[PDB]
Amino acid sequence: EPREEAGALGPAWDESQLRSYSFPTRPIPRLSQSDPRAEELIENEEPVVLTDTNLVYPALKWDLEYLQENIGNGDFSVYSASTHKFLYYDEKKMANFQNFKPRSNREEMKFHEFVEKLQDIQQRGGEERLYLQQTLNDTVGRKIVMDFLGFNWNWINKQQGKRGWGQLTSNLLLIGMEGNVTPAHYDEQQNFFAQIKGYKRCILFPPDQFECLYPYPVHHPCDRQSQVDFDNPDYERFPNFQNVVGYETVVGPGDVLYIPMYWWHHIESLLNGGITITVNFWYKGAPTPKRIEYPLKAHQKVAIMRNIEKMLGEALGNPQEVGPLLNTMIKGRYN
Amino acid sequence: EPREEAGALGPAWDESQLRSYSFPTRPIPRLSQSDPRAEELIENEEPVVLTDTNLVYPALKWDLEYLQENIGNGDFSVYSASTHKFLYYDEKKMANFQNFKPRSNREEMKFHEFVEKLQDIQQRGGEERLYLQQTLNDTVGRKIVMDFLGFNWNWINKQQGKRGWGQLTSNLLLIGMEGNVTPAHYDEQQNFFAQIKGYKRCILFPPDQFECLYPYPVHHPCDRQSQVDFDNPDYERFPNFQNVVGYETVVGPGDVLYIPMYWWHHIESLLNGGITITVNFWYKGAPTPKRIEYPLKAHQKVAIMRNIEKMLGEALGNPQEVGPLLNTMIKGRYN
Numbered sequence: 001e002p003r004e005e006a007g008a009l010g011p012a013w014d015e016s017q018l019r020s021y022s023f024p025t026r027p028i029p030r031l032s033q034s035d036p037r038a039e040e041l042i043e044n045e046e047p048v049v050l051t052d053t054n055l056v057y058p059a060l061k062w063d064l065e066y067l068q069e070n071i072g073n074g075d076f077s078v079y080s081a082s083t084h085k086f087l088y089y090d091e092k093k094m095a096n097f098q099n100f101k102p103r104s105n106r107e108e109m110k111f112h113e114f115v116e117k118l119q120d121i122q123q124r125g126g127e128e129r130l131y132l133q134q135t136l137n138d139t140v141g142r143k144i145v146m147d148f149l150g151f152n153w154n155w156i157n158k159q160q161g162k163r164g165w166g167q168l169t170s171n172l173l174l175i176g177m178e179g180n181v182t183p184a185h186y187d188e189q190q191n192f193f194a195q196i197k198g199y200k201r202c203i204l205f206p207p208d209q210f211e212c213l214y215p216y217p218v219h220h221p222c223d224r225q226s227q228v229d230f231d232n233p234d235y236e237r238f239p240n241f242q243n244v245v246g247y248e249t250v251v252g253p254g255d256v257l258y259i260p261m262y263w264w265h266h267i268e269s270l271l272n273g274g275i276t277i278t279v280n281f282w283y284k285g286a287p288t289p290k291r292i293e294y295p296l297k298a299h300q301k302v303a304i305m306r307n308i309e310k311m312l313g314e315a316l317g318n319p320q321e322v323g324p325l326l327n328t329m330i331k332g333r334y335n
Numbered sequence: 336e337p338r339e340e341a342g343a344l345g346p347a348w349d350e351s352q353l354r355s356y357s358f359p360t361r362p363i364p365r366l367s368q369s370d371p372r373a374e375e376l377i378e379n380e381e382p383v384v385l386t387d388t389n390l391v392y393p394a395l396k397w398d399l400e401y402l403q404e405n406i407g408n409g410d411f412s413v414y415s416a417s418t419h420k421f422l423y424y425d426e427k428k429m430a431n432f433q434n435f436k437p438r439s440n441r442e443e444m445k446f447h448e449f450v451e452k453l454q455d456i457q458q459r460g461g462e463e464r465l466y467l468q469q470t471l472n473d474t475v476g477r478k479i480v481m482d483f484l485g486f487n488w489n490w491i492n493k494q495q496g497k498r499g500w501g502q503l504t505s506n507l508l509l510i511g512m513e514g515n516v517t518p519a520h521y522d523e524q525q526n527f528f529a530q531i532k533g534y535k536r537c538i539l540f541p542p543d544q545f546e547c548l549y550p551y552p553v554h555h556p557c558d559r560q561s562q563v564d565f566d567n568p569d570y571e572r573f574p575n576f577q578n579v580v581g582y583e584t585v586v587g588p589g590d591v592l593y594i595p596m597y598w599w600h601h602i603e604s605l606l607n608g609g610i611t612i613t614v615n616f617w618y619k620g621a622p623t624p625k626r627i628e629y630p631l632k633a634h635q636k637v638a639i640m641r642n643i644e645k646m647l648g649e650a651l652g653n654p655q656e657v658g659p660l661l662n663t664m665i666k667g668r669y670n
């Protein structure tokens with residue numbers, strides 16, 4: 001259920017702001033960073049929402065006015081879409097599938113241009129949607145650097161150490177419009193997902209639900225995304241989607257969501273909730289141990305499947321032949 | 336059609352001695368070793384029957400009386416079966432499938448015992464069937480060694496050289512009863528199949544008909560055999576068997592059939608034709624070239640499929656999990 005804001009300011013959000021879907025869910029635990037149950041969840045690679053990390057405390061004052069003034073004159077990737085679904089695709093793989101036309105057009109622009117185009121849309125009541133997704137880098141201004149340095153690196157660096165993770169790969173600045181949806185997908189990195197402004201509903205699925213979520217081929221641009229349209233699921237093509245069960249939560253300013261590697265996540269900015277701001281923290285997973293302990297984890301089997309698809313594409317000399325060979329291998333033999 | 340014996344002795348065989356099957360065939364060419372068309376077939380890894388190699392000329396005098404006297408007192412593997420089908424299975428893999436019970440019982444015995452048990456069956460008109468399949472080795476007697484040395488090693492060694500093949504892996508002595516059938520299977524070696532006594536009908540299928548012949552899993556004891564019962568094909572499980580087309584021939588004394596590596600072959604001793612004797616010559620294929628030339632050959636794709644199945648069994652730690660993972664990989668993704 002919804003949490004209540006301090007000072008009797010009422011519920012920060014209500015259930016009417018959540019999109020409706022076909023599957024059940026149960027809540028992700030919301031715990032204190034000091035709660036040993038939280039440490040045991042992270043250690044066991046299960047999601048948890050940490051409510052008191054102060055991980056991005058200096059950034060909670062961030063809004064568009066503050067950011068436009070201080071974030072500098074770097075280039076910012078901005079994605080557009082006529083729909084509320086922003087497809088998570090890979091431009092590098094778009095050669096393999098010359099018949100895929102993305103619905104999200106990316107445009108590189110300056111931050112003040114992003115704010116203006118967002119203003120124009122609001123002014124003219126248009127229905128276009130935007131989502132800024134830019135990797136924080138050196139070009140940012142001095143006041144943003146100060147805020148960045150003020151993150152709780154003591155806490156997150158200890159986590160990185162305790163879990164044997166690799167190095168911090170990148171920090172994404174995410175600014176979206178209300179109602180924006182990032183479709184279900186999984187990442188090959190560990191993620192601390194730090195909510196700054198507004199509210200995002202996060203629906204996670206464990207890696208062992210690979211069978212119910214039907215990812216695109218590895219060589220397809222939408223690799224690691226679910227093929228299932230959550231708003232109109234085609235149960236004839238994706239029958240096991242009727243067996244999916246999610247882990248759900250709404251994160252607001254100050255919350256940090258641990259999204260374990262290989263865990264599917266569907267992320268939506270709440271309807272009529274205003275703009276949302278998030279910074280995430282991606283870390284390479286711990287290295288694979290020398291002695292493999294059976295039985296394998298679900299995510300290890302996903303890695304095996306990915307590697308098979310990759311090698312088959314290399315050996316055949318064409319990713320388009322992967323599908324035909326795999327069917328040849330199974331039809332009448334393993335089915 | 337049937338060939339005619341020299342001296343007006345009539346047709347060596349007639350069509351009534353061939354079992355009836357559901358698929359069409361076209362004949363394998365029967366050519367002289369000196370015919371350049373024969374060399375081009377072998378070079379292109381296509382089957383050909385060579386009629387004048389004299390490859391096993393000294394062995395054409397062989398019969399059970401001569402062999403029992405001179406072949407020595409070694410052990411000979413003899414397979415039995417209540418049916419005319421002798422299943423080509425692997426005892427080493429029988430651990431993976433503890434629910435597979437072979438129909439062919441192997442018994443190790445001396446050659447005179449093989450002849451006697453064959454005599455008893457004939458005497459009592461029983462319906463049991465036998466097939467002797469023993470790798471020629473050192474234990475053979477002096478007169479058989481003399482015959483072996485008298486093979487045409489000049490010709491076959493030149494073939495081995497011209498084709499870049501590896502070394503001769505083994506020579507099998509095959510003695511079967513009329514009507515015996517070795518079900519369709521492929522071998523991972525090059526084979527010169529030298530017919531000595533009696534007549535065998537050989538039905539070959541190219542490697543690109545993998546889809547129509549449904550081999551067992553690689554880890555199954557009957558690896559490399561077709562799952563399809565040629566006498567009663569289950570078209571519901573094996574629908575593409577209705578598209579199979581074979582290459583057919585009957586080899587008699589003096590003929591040599593080149594069975595190229597990875598080519599399926601179904602081999603049957605002719606009905607009411609008496610006992611059959613064959614010696615085959617297995618060679619390791621030429622090494623895979625350093626620069627792979629695309630498009631791949633059909634047999635290279637078969638090798639890829641075999642390797643995928645093998646690696647999946649090793650990685651998962653159990654060959655029984657191969658099937659489930661492959662289905663998970665394809666369902667709703669590549670089909």
Ligand SMILES: CC1(C)c2ccccc2-c2ccc(C[C@@H](CC(=O)O)C(=O)C(=O)O)cc21
Nearest residue numbers: 079086087088089131133174182187267280
């Ligand atoms: C939707 C978008 C802007 C996008 C478009 C095109 C290519 C890639 C991406 C991409 C990658 C990550 C995110 C952040 C977050 C989802 C969220 O919060 O919306 C998430 O999935 C994660 O932290 O792992 C968002 C995006």
Ligand SMILES: CC1(C)c2ccccc2-c2ccc(C[C@@H](CC(=O)O)C(=O)C(=O)O)cc21
Nearest residue numbers: 414421422423424466468509517522602615
């Ligand atoms: C049927 C039999 C006796 C068998 C039983 C159990 C395990 C293995 C084998 C095996 C292997 C080879 C052959 C010879 C030939 C077929 C033929 O002429 O009958 C052939 O397939 C080939 O030369 O490649 C025959 C057999």
Ligand SMILES: [Zn+2]
Nearest residue numbers: 185186187265
């Ligand atoms: Zn993600």
Ligand SMILES: [Zn+2]
Nearest residue numbers: 520521522600
């Ligand atoms: Zn064979």
